[PDB]
Amino acid sequence: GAARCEGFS
Amino acid sequence: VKPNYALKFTLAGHTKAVSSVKFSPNGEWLASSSADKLIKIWGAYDGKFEKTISGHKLGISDVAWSSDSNLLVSASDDKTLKIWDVSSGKCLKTLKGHSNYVFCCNFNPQSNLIVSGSFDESVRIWDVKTGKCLKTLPAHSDPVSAVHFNRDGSLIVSSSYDGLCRIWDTASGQCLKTLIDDDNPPVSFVKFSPNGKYILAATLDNTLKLWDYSKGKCLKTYTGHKNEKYCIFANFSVTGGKWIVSGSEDNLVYIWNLQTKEIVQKLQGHTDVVISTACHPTENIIASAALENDKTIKLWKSDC
């Protein structure tokens, strides 16, 4: 995927 | 006065979450990047699909245009950036040297340099012509969420999950300023204003803030949207009224009056988080893009 599309968890 | 943005086109074709959309400086094109590892080019006025640009090995978090609208740079989880010739689709250079995901990227106004930010907590400055890394700045202590050059390229602003915005001298790499307010939420986005006087910073406490970075003073705050998790782009809209535009985690586009800070419009229709918005350089047009459960880009037009 892409880090931006995952968000900060 | 309030805008009247209305949905005109919905652009489908990315097979995973969109990550960023950007209008070309000449107004002709929209570029979009996605977790599906692809860049797509669309007509800015009709939303007509133009082409797909491929070659990254993992998803793309950001894409940006050169000032003459001829080149793109993309930032990928594959820890590279890529410089593309849009007309030919060629990958001109692969910029290698970050040790973790590359999250954000921009050309300088001359478009002879690229600035990048990464999960490796560094900011890097690259030569466009050779693809070589010129400088690595030990900028932050957490992932770098945004990087942007000022009006003449003399300065770089960076933002990070570490809660800081920093201003860097492009030539020397010195840290000229650190900006942070009374609370320390992660900073998820930053950019200079069109006139270069201000920076607009997003934090993951549902807040946008307009700063005079020279004086180090927070001048305006914009609230009412939801932003606690994602690095959502924000924009200055200057073609008609002077607005602030942002995506939101309640699936809406928010538009604020820049001076009064009142919400003046909310655009409804995406089915997931609006991760990215862009404002057309000459027409009252907004592009918006949403995450995995939506996968679409929408074009909205207003009379002011």
Residue numbers in the entry:
A (entry chain C): 40 to 48
B (entry chain A): 31 to 334
What does the paper say about this structure?
Several structures of WDR5 in complex with a series of mutated MBD3C peptides were determined to comprehend the underlying molecular basis of the WDR5 B site recognition. Although a new water molecule is introduced into the vicinity of WDR5 Cys261, it does not have the ability to generate a hydrogen bond with WDR5 Tyr191. Nevertheless, the Phe47 residue in the mutated MBD3C exhibits a 2.2 Å outward displacement from the WDR5 B site, leading to a notable reduction in its interaction area with this pocket. Taken together, these data collectively indicated that both MBD3C Phe47 and the residues connecting MBD3C Arg43 and Phe47 are crucial for its interaction with the WDR5 B site. Indeed, consistent with our prediction, the structures confirmed that the residues at positions +1 ∼ +3 play important roles in the distinct conformation of phenylalanine inserted into the WDR5 B pocket.
pmcWDR5, a well-established core scaffolding protein found in histone methyltransferase complexes MLL1-4 and SET1A/B, was initially characterized as an epigenetic histone “writer” to recognize histone H3 lysine 4 (H3K4) and is essential for H3K4 di- and tri-methylation (H3K4me2 and H3K4me3) to activate gene transcription. Two separate and non-overlapping sites located on opposite surfaces of WDR5 mediate most of its interactions with binding partners: an arginine-bearing cavity located on the surface known as the WDR5-interacting (WIN) site, and a shallow cleft on the opposite side referred to as the WDR5-binding (WBM) site. The residues Val31-Cys334 of WDR5 are visible and consist of seven WD40 repeats that form a seven-bladed β-propeller structure.
